[PDB]
Symmetry: C3
Subunit: 357 residues, 3 copies
């Protein structure tokens, strides 16, 4: 039987419960309108799956170890991806060749060939088992491998000029949910600007050229100390864009931070370095290498975003949930009505028809 | 007191509101079955935390600068991860040595040693302060650094053979939520296939070997132009899997796009190039290097996914939300019934027991 | 008119339906406290958008090709990022020069110059078009390019010592929504610890030093085979932290996996290798190179996390959803009461005030 049910309903008309209920309903409606609808923008579809493309190029020349270093010297790796290192300090061990020689760390002091056993395996090469004089004052165990051993201990200068190097970032982003593409280079960017522009969060925040020194500052770091220990900075690019607004309002927000934080909270491992070697060999077959311990700033360009564009389906479901939520005030209004007019017995009786068996 | 409450209810039996309510219920149920259940597949749990692995290897040989280039010559970096560059064009500066020489861009034209001060510090090397004859017609400032300076400007040919190179991808994906692992190399991949296979959207869509020219075509690019300016292409690998279906129906979908989008939309920064150097030294200790300004196509293999497998809890909560939603027709049924039969007063009186105090 | 509506309600008092409904309500409340509140911890805000930075440094020395290899030889690339390779096996093709020579894979068998045409376009250098003796028994096609050609096929040893190398990880993580930073190096780590500590999932899970052999074991991989074939293992670092709990309880979880899973289930692509060359050139201008086909284990240090901390708004809306959901038992209690008490007619009559017209 095609029959429509609906509840029998009391309809109190107290001025008190009337105004207090209407106020609770106003609060529910205004909360839903201002927060869930305007602020949390539930009337639109969101895309968080952003597609990004980063190309980098470092520029500047510097003095180090009586050489002029350009980008090809101090940038590692070279292909201009979203992570690169600018080397600020180098510990060179020139012309290592495969052979025999003693370690240089005091960690390996010896007087007898018997002390040189399978105890201290890492580092350099493999122990020959002998104990040999490294200097007039010290004897250490002898090893086979790249000779001479590097000294990890005496401090070298840092490349101050690196502070005035420039990082050019070229970022392309695409929101597929809205098939919307844009990049951090606006069409009114000129060659002349590129030649002279200066990124600053306030003074010029759209300039693709970033002074290393500026970035180090924005992250609150002392170039002098960071360049000595090495470390990692993040240049974050955020694209939070409401596509319901104007196309030219989808704009890049740059942020600057140091990522290897644990390092400062550590006296044991204070920075970021790595070791690699330049490989040569003579007209004789013999090979030799230049070993560099490289200290520098790693830069991660970090691109995130999320975009919203209005759609009818989310709006519809949000308004339906809104209407279904206007009802929830009834329980509080029940409590007020049934316990705050002295004649509560009247209302409990009016509303509740007891039964028993 | 162990008491069960339930409201007093009108139970109208008008044929009109009866059938209109039953039809509204049929529509709510059919939306929930067709949309929320079949389409949006709400009966299963979804996992997007996919685990992926990309291993790459390039093949091909070409003529450039009267040499045969193999992969080790044109692929950078070499380790065959999900991002790599295939170099298509090169502007070379042979045998740079550390020294003194004049700059070569007209950007540094001078007549006086006084123009060459500490003002235009980046690029090439460091100004020595003199102004030097660069050619019989031109004077530019002298610098200390890698000499001679690179000439940026004469356009060089591209490596046409690069079009016919092959990119081999090896992708492993794993869904931890369902402990389901699979890769883009289907168990029916044979050696003979590998020897001749052919990625093609139609003819061989599971061939792990992709022609560069193909991929460039697929991104809607002209190899000539891309090989001239450089760029970044994305090879996307999708694992959209309905695990309720067959294990052998979990299949990879290849899709092709150019990620450095801003570049064609820009007159200032039109492609992708980078600079790196081959470091040598004479039998004498003397160092010399080959400076390469490298133009090429960047490929990043992009693996995303989501799989769903049925679970009981999503079905339970969706059916619970269904029943809690079946009522929602009542507000519309109320307005129609309670305001469109002229004798609406009957229903108001039967339903509404007014009160006053 | 500020008027409050509310439904009229039956109020059964049967002991039976009283306890059965009260039990259903107890079960809903206990589930909501135990599941949605204790387990799924809905009283707190979650952030998964963790920012992470990894720096690695590999250590150990080993014998390969009758040389001692240190980190600068076998780790690639060298900058100490979240992905690196420890090379375990090498197939070297020494002193290659650009020239003419026949191929060395049997894939290029020939007897006549007519077989070597533009027919088999890929691979090696360019076919010179002639057919030349490769061996006393076999003839292959001649190519222009780096000579002699590499033979991929003769089996070489592995660097057994690689098993005993050590990977040092330094991970910095940041939950930005709660602006909480920490690292995997706890402040009570000493130099002495670093010198001798030993990572173990149970005994010392905070030692940042992981023996490669251990990592290979933990991923359920056999060093000998992984080192022969090459492969990819994942080192995942998880930060599951309840900030409501103790601060020194935000702790990293190590997990070990092989990511290139497709490799073992496949007869086509069994490991991980790549090729690169050491570049030299004579005192004559002419270049010659050492070609290495490099086999090793790739390492991805994989950092995920999510933190939850109590907030009032999630607690409020969960308690609200709890109370609004407690009602749902009424439908089942209706069916039970109105059809399983013999006096169902009493309640049908009490509750339902029919209408007809
Ligand atoms: N770090 C940087 N500092 C200043 N300008 C830069 C930097 N990187 C790139 N540019 C400039 O931005 C413009 C576009 O960069 P791009 O490298 O794509 O062009 P290019 O002609 O290859 O550059 P270049 O010839 O200067 O190496 C160029 O004019 C270049 O001079
Ligand atoms: N793979 C490893 N195995 C054991 N200890 C290591 C390893 N890597 C680093 N350490 C220890 O932790 C310390 C911090 O390393 P970091 O690279 O930050 O600086 P470093 O002193 O130049 O390293 P090293 O002296 O090993 O070259 C190191 O000095 C070293 O003693
Ligand atoms: N870019 C490519 N084009 C064509 N074939 C490829 C390519 N990459 C790999 N292959 C083939 O796929 C197989 C899997 O590659 P894998 O590197 O695992 O083996 P491999 O022995 O090192 O290959 P090869 O030595 O022949 O390059 C190889 O036998 C190789 O022939
Ligand atoms: O998911 C958490 C929630 O946080 C933010 O909301 C804040 C709000 O910004 C503040 O004004 C504060 O007073 O109230 C909220 C605390 O929960 C975001 O605005 C919101 O989008 C985000 O979801
Ligand atoms: O592109 C025009 C655009 O108009 C509408 O945009 C509105 C939007 O609804 C509001 O949120 C506001 O912030 O911006 C506009 C009104 O000033 C719609 O987004 C859409 O129909 C259309 O694309
Ligand atoms: O809630 C957003 C919604 O977006 C998409 O829904 C599509 C639907 O799939 C199309 O068939 C179209 O006709 O209607 C909607 C308009 O976007 C997603 O399919 C879905 O996952 C998501 O719920
Ligand atoms: O193939 C065995 C498989 O059977 C079941 O899968 C069903 C699935 O649940 C249904 O949605 C239906 O549409 O397709 C499948 C039948 O092919 C279960 O998943 C399980 O028993 C098992 O995995
Ligand atoms: O169902 C997805 C679910 O997985 C986990 O929940 C578990 C729960 O932890 C166990 O106690 C079990 O008995 O019930 C569920 C079945 O897996 C996750 O904890 C949870 O986040 C997720 O929703
Ligand atoms: O200690 C400050 C911290 O207190 C709160 O954490 C509580 C938590 O809610 C309780 O469940 C209890 O078990 O642990 C803590 C009490 O010591 C909040 O997390 C937060 O307001 C505050 O930071
Ligand atoms: C940066 O350049 C300015 C002007 O060329 C100079 O005064 C300053 O010393 C430079 N910074 C460093 C760290 O050398
Ligand atoms: C280019 O136009 C945009 C659009 O509003 C504007 O923000 C910007 O200032 C313009 N470019 C420059 C260099 O001022
Ligand atoms: C190779 O010749 C050089 C001299 O140019 C010499 O230093 C080196 O010791 C020779 N190699 C061997 C193994 O003797
Ligand atoms: C690419 O290969 C096709 C056939 O495989 C050939 O016709 C074409 O000439 C090749 N392109 C180049 C630049 O060699
Ligand atoms: C391999 O299997 C896929 C589906 O799993 C099928 O489409 C394809 O035809 C198969 N290839 C061969 C050579 O049978
Ligand atoms: C690795 O070290 C262990 C114990 O220190 C030793 O037993 C084993 O022989 C070593 N293996 C190699 C290849 O050096
Ligand atoms: C350092 O503290 C952590 C946690 O507070 C603890 O697990 C570890 O045992 C401590 N270190 C030592 C050397 O005991
Ligand atoms: C360069 O010199 C080497 C020997 O030093 C010789 O083998 C080679 O053929 C020469 N080539 C040219 C082009 O001079
Ligand atoms: Ca040391
Ligand atoms: Ca230029
Ligand atoms: Ca081969």
């Amino acid at each position: 039987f095609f029959t429509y049910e609906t509840p029998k309903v009391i309809v109190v008309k107290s001025w008190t419960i009337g105004i207090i209920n209407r106020v609770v309903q106003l609060l529910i409606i205004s909360y839903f309108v201002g927060w869930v609808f305007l602020h949390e923008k539930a009337y639109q579809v969101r895309d968080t799956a952003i597609e990004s493309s980063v190309v980098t190029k470092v520029k500047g020349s510097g003095l180090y170890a009586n050489r002029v270093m350009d980008v090809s010297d101090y940038v590692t790796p070279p292909q201009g991806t979203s992570v690169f290192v600018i080397i600020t300090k180098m510990i060179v061990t020139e012309n290592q060749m495969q052979g025999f020689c003693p370690e240089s760390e005091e960690k390996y002091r010896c007087v007898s060939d018997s002390q040189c056993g399978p105890e201290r395996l890492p580092g350099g090469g493999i122990l020959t088992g002998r104990c040999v004089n490294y200097s007039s004052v010290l004897r250490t165990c002898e090893i086979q491998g790249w000779c001479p051993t590097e000294v990890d201990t005496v401090e070298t200068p840092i490349m101050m000029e690196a502070e005035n190097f420039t990082i050019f970032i070229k970022n392309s982003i695409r929101f597929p949910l809205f098939n919307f593409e844009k990049g951090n280079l606006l069409p009114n960017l000129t060659a002349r600007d590129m030649k002279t522009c200066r990124f600053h969060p306030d003074k010029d925040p759209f300039c693709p050229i970033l002074r290393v020194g500026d970035v180090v500052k924005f992250a609150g770091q002392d170039f002098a100390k960071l360049a000595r220990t090495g470390g990692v900075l993040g240049i974050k690019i955020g694209w939070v864009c409401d596509l319901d607004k104007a196309w030219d309002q989808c704009i890049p927000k740059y942020s600057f931070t140091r990522l290897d934080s644990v390092s400062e909270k550590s006296s044991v491992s204070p920075g970021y370095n790595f070791r690699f070697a330049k490989y040569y060999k003579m007209e004789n077959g013999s090979e030799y290498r230049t070993l560099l311990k490289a200290f520098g700033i790693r830069f991660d360009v970090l691109v995130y975003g999320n975009a919203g564009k209005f759609n009818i389906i989310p709006t519809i479901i949000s308004s339906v949930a809104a209407f279904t939520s206007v009802g929830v005030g009834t329980v509080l209004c029940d409590i007020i009505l049934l316990n705050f007019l002295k004649g509560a017995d009247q209302y409990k009786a009016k509303k509740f028809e007891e039964v028993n068996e």
